[PDB]
Amino acid sequence: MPDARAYWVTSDLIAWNVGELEQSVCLYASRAAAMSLSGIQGYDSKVELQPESAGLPETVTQKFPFISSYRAFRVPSSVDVASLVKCQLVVASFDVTGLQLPGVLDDMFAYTGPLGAVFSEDSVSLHLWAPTAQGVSVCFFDGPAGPALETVQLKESNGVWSVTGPREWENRYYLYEVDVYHPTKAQVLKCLAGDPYARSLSANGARTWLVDINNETLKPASWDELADEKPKLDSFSDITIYELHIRDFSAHDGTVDSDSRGGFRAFAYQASAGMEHLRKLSDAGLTHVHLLPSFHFAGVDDIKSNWKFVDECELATFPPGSDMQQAAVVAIQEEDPYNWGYNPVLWGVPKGSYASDPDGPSRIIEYRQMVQALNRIGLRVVMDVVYNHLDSSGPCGISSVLDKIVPGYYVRRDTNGQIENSAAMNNTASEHFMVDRLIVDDLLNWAVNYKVDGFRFDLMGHIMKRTMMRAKSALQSLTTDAHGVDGSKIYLYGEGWDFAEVARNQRGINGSQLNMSGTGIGSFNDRIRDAINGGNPFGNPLQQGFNTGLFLEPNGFYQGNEADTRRSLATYADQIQIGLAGNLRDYVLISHTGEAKKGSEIHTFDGLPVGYTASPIETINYVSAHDNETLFDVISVKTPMILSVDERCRINHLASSMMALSQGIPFFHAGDEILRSKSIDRDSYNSGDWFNKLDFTYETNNWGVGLPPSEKNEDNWPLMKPRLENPSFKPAKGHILAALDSFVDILKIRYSSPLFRLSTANDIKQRVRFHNTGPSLVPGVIVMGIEDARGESPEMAQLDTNFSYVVTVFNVCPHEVSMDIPALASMGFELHPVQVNSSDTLVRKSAYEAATGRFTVPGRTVSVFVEPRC
Ligand SMILES: OC[C@H]1O[C@H](O[C@H]2[C@H](O)[C@@H](O)[C@@H](SC[C@H]3O[C@@H]4O[C@H]5[C@H](O)[C@@H](O)[C@@H](O[C@H]6[C@H](O)[C@@H](O)[C@@H](O[C@H]7[C@H](O)[C@@H](O)[C@@H](O[C@H]8[C@H](O)[C@@H](O)[C@@H](O[C@H]9[C@H](O)[C@@H](O)[C@@H](O[C@H]%10[C@H](O)[C@@H](O)[C@@H](O[C@H]3[C@H](O)[C@H]4O)O[C@@H]%10CO)O[C@@H]9CO)O[C@@H]8CO)O[C@@H]7CO)O[C@@H]6CO)O[C@@H]5CO)O[C@@H]2CO)[C@H](O)[C@@H](O)[C@@H]1O
Ligand SMILES: [Ca+2]
Numbered sequence: 001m002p003d004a005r006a007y008w009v010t011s012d013l014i015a016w017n018v019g020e021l022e023q024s025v026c027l028y029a030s031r032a033a034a035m036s037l038s039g040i041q042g043y044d045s046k047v048e049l050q051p052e053s054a055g056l057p058e059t060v061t062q063k064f065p066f067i068s069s070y071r072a073f074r075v076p077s078s079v080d081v082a083s084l085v086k087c088q089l090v091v092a093s094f095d096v097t098g099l100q101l102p103g104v105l106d107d108m109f110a111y112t113g114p115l116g117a118v119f120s121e122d123s124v125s126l127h128l129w130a131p132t133a134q135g136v137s138v139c140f141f142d143g144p145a146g147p148a149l150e151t152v153q154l155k156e157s158n159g160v161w162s163v164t165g166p167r168e169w170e171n172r173y174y175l176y177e178v179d180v181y182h183p184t185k186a187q188v189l190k191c192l193a194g195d196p197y198a199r200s201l202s203a204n205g206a207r208t209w210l211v212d213i214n215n216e217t218l219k220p221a222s223w224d225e226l227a228d229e230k231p232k233l234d235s236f237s238d239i240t241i242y243e244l245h246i247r248d249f250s251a252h253d254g255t256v257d258s259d260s261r262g263g264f265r266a267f268a269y270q271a272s273a274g275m276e277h278l279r280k281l282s283d284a285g286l287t288h289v290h291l292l293p294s295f296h297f298a299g300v301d302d303i304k305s306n307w308k309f310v311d312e313c314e315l316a317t318f319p320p321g322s323d324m325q326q327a328a329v330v331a332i333q334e335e336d337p338y339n340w341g342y343n344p345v346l347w348g349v350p351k352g353s354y355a356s357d358p359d360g361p362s363r364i365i366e367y368r369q370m371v372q373a374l375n376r377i378g379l380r381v382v383m384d385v386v387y388n389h390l391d392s393s394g395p396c397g398i399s400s401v402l403d404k405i406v407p408g409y410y411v412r413r414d415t416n417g418q419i420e421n422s423a424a425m426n427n428t429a430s431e432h433f434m435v436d437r438l439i440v441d442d443l444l445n446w447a448v449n450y451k452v453d454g455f456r457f458d459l460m461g462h463i464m465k466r467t468m469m470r471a472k473s474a475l476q477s478l479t480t481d482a483h484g485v486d487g488s489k490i491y492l493y494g495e496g497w498d499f500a501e502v503a504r505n506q507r508g509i510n511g512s513q514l515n516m517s518g519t520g521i522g523s524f525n526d527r528i529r530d531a532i533n534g535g536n537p538f539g540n541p542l543q544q545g546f547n548t549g550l551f552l553e554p555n556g557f558y559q560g561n562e563a564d565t566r567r568s569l570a571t572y573a574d575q576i577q578i579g580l581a582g583n584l585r586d587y588v589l590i591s592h593t594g595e596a597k598k599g600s601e602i603h604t605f606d607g608l609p610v611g612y613t614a615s616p617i618e619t620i621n622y623v624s625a626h627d628n629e630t631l632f633d634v635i636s637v638k639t640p641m642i643l644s645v646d647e648r649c650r651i652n653h654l655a656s657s658m659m660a661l662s663q664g665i666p667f668f669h670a671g672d673e674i675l676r677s678k679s680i681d682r683d684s685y686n687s688g689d690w691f692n693k694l695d696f697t698y699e700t701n702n703w704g705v706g707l708p709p710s711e712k713n714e715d716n717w718p719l720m721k722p723r724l725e726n727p728s729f730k731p732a733k734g735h736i737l738a739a740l741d742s743f744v745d746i747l748k749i750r751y752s753s754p755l756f757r758l759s760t761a762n763d764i765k766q767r768v769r770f771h772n773t774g775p776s777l778v779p780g781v782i783v784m785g786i787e788d789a790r791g792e793s794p795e796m797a798q799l800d801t802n803f804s805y806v807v808t809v810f811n812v813c814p815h816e817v818s819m820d821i822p823a824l825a826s827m828g829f830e831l832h833p834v835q836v837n838s839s840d841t842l843v844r845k846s847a848y849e850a851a852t853g854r855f856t857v858p859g860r861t862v863s864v865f866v867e868p869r870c
């Protein structure tokens with residue numbers, strides 16, 4: 001983008017950071033974009049701006065904090081602002097620079113009326129917001145491939161272009177022809193653009209399909225009664241999440257027909273191994289499946305005849321630590337069917353590559369059939385929404401839509417006018433009114449038109465808090481009577497990471513972890529993640545954590561002396577325990593020094609509070625996700641090499657059990673339960689089906705299938721190779737099935753007692769106690785007690801009709817421990833019936849001794865004890 005260091009913030013105010021003396025500022029305009037530097041030449045009009053020593057007003061400095069110190073310049077009322085914003089514009093001092101227009105575009109043209117296509121009994125109308133455009137027409141087509149049918153002009157009213165046609169316009173395909181000034185090219189360009197409000201598209205979004213989303217033929221059988229069939233959700237506190245990629249789910253599933261693998265239709269195969277797997281988890285108590293991006297994204301061709309694949313039989317013959325597998329994958333990675341999909345083009349349309357036919361209605365109906373089928377096996381559906389950036393910007397290319405139409409508006413820019421890229425590329429600006437509008441409108445589209453049950457917000461910290469809250473309110477007020485869905489059950493969460501240009505609320509109060517405290521919107525708890533696994537996404541891969549052998553089982557990487565590692569372990573245990581108690585600001589823990597500390601008073605990187613939430617439903621507790629190494633892989637990297645796979649399997653279980661028995665909302669990565677490996681790939685977004693294999697035959701976990709792709713992994717290839725080559729690292733089917741069995745059981749334990757899912761911070765503060773704390777704590781053990789009403793005259797409600805007390809012991813030590821808790825002596829504790837009947841013979845040996853309150857727990861085991869009310 002070229003130089004644009006001034007801002008047109010309101011109809012009558014311009015902001016520019018020039019010095020006092022620099023009283024001679026003028027605004028130049030050229031409709032045909034013909035200006036040059038002399039003194040400016042080739043302008044239609046020149047107007048002097050009167051300086052404003054009142055400074056920028058409250059509303060401007062609140063909306064754009066980062067420019068709050070800029071000098072304000074008054075635009076004379078003689079200026080025709082509507083005409084000027086359609087021109088090439090510069091201001092000059094006596095230094096020349098362009099103008100960033102979003103402030104004035106919102107001030108004058110913020111619009112709440114219909115956008116996209118509106119269907120009435122006798123007509124179809126199209127509406128497009130494009131206040132800077134000099135002209136807008138619509139080019140129609142009869143079909144996704146054929147020649148032009150006709151072009152119709154749209155007429156502008158207050159920034160919005162519209163036209164109304166007959167009802168027979170329905171099912172045509174179309175594009176907008178938009179004449180608009182593009183700063184990056186310094187020309188008025190005729191751009192061919194899709195509809196931001198599209199509901200369907202031809203292959204690759206080349207054309208927009210003028211479809212009526214309410215048409216009966218787009219509805220699966222019994223679609224309108226899906227609300228009645230949706231699984232009950234009594235509380236957000238009952239949520240558990242399973243994070244799954246649509247292609248991963250069925251790409252390798254032989255029980256699905258070959259022509260129907262990798263997409264929406266695969267979820268209709270109820271008897272498939274994959275759907276039987278999800279049924280098993282759902283039956284054990286899992287409530288939500290979070291699907292990776294499933295809207296129209298770039299990086300996968302919708303046209304299946306262009307898809308390329310590796311020779312799977314050849315690659316199977318290569319050695320487990322060879323670099324040849326990744327070479328073959330990388331050779332086709334730009335042309336294969338695979339991508340996570342974090343490359344947004346149009347948010348409101350199902351991804352064509354996941355449909356049976358990317359032209360016509362299959363993408364709509366099949367998406368609905370997917371939601372319906374998941375709901376029918378007891379699972380609510382969460383969509384991974386990516387509102388923080390766009391795949392592309394500018395006037396050219398199939399993958400640029402929003403920035404084609406209103407350049408420099410939907411995207412966030414720096415103080416020189418260059419597009420911000422911290423999210424990946426082409427960061428959006430939800431701080432702008434129509435971006436905020438599009439985000440909320442899209443969410444309501446998915447909630448109402450596809451009956452989606454929740455949303456995970458990618459880089460929520462890059463979205464304005466006001467956008468998140470307005471969305472939350474709109475979604476949760478939807479009703480079955482008015483909209484066909486119970487909005488009160490719709491749950492929102494996201495990545496509240498706080499970095500780059502949105503840090504320190506520089507663009508407004510953003511959706512960071514700290515800012516979302518007290519909003520009821522979940523965010524990923526990175527503190528528990530890193531405390532359990534060790535290190536961080538950017539640190540040394542060998543840095544150990546609570547569950548990967550820090551102090552207890554050192555791996556040979558130097559991490560201080562024995563006192564240092566013991567202290568680091570205890571510090572991590574503090575952070576874990578705050579997390580296990582819902583990661584609350586106000587929860588009081590006896591810290592490892594002996595000092596009682598609130599969750600907010602225990603600090604992490606940059607002195608920030610470990611516990612930052614106001615409620616447990618604000619905490620998404622996780623140790624694994626699609627990003628970074630899988631749970632199996634991180635454990636395989638960090639633990640001592642000499643551990644057996646049997647031992648590491650127990651360690652995998654410990655990690656997922658800490659999540660499954662935590663207060664707040666547990667989050668599991670698809671494959672946690674079956675030891676899923678990516679052969680240590682840290683960023684597998686483009687590593688294809690080969691490295692992302694989800695094997696529901698349970699014969700393999702995909703460990704030892706070659707070094708992962710060099711671009712993101714080569715620096716760590718030396719640590720990976722000997723591990724991938726070592727046959728003792730690889731689990732067999734027996735291990736995989738045992739991992740699944742123990743995962744199902746811990747879910748069952750979570751849902752066996754309301755005490756694991758307390759709904760408020762007050763409840764957690766009153767009921768949750770940790771019993772192995774302080775400087776003399778027993779290393780490698782966490783003891784978590786949860787109290788219910790007991791005796792006559794209780795100080796709390798009775799939440800659990802079966803149990804009056806629950807105690808969980810997480811023992812990561814490679815030996816049995818005996819934990820004496822005198823305060824829990826002389827009580828009726830016994831092993832949880834699920835564990836009494838476990839297929840794992842070791843956990844059955846767990847015991848309680850009444851006289852001393854001793855809980856005896858085997859090595860590498862989580863033991864749950866309950867006090868029956870009988
Ligand atoms: O990318 C453009 C962008 O880069 C910078 O912004 C980064 C920022 O500086 C950084 O802190 C994080 S912020 C998001 C993050 O927040 C928490 O993380 C905290 C850590 O837990 C904590 O330890 C501490 O981190 C420090 C490290 O310990 C320290 O070693 C040092 O890190 C170096 C690193 O050693 C070096 O290699 C390099 O990193 C590059 C990587 O090597 C590349 O792989 C790539 O990174 C990718 C990454 O592979 C992807 O997975 C994806 O990252 C995701 C994570 O997976 C998520 O978990 C999440 O990260 C959170 C943590 O979870 C949370 O605990 O979001 C990430 C972003 O979506 O994408 C990455 C980017 O492509 O590229 C990086 C290049 O940076 O450099 C780093 C230092 O930058 O220093 C850090 C302290 O800074 O504090 C953390 C909190 O700050 O990531 C930002 C995005 O990359 C520029 O500042 C910014 O202006 C620019 O626009
Ligand atoms: Ca269920």
Ligand SMILES: [Ca+2]
Nearest residue numbers: 333334338339
């Ligand atoms: Ca790919």
Ligand SMILES: [Cl-]
Nearest residue numbers: 258261262337
């Ligand atoms: Cl396929």
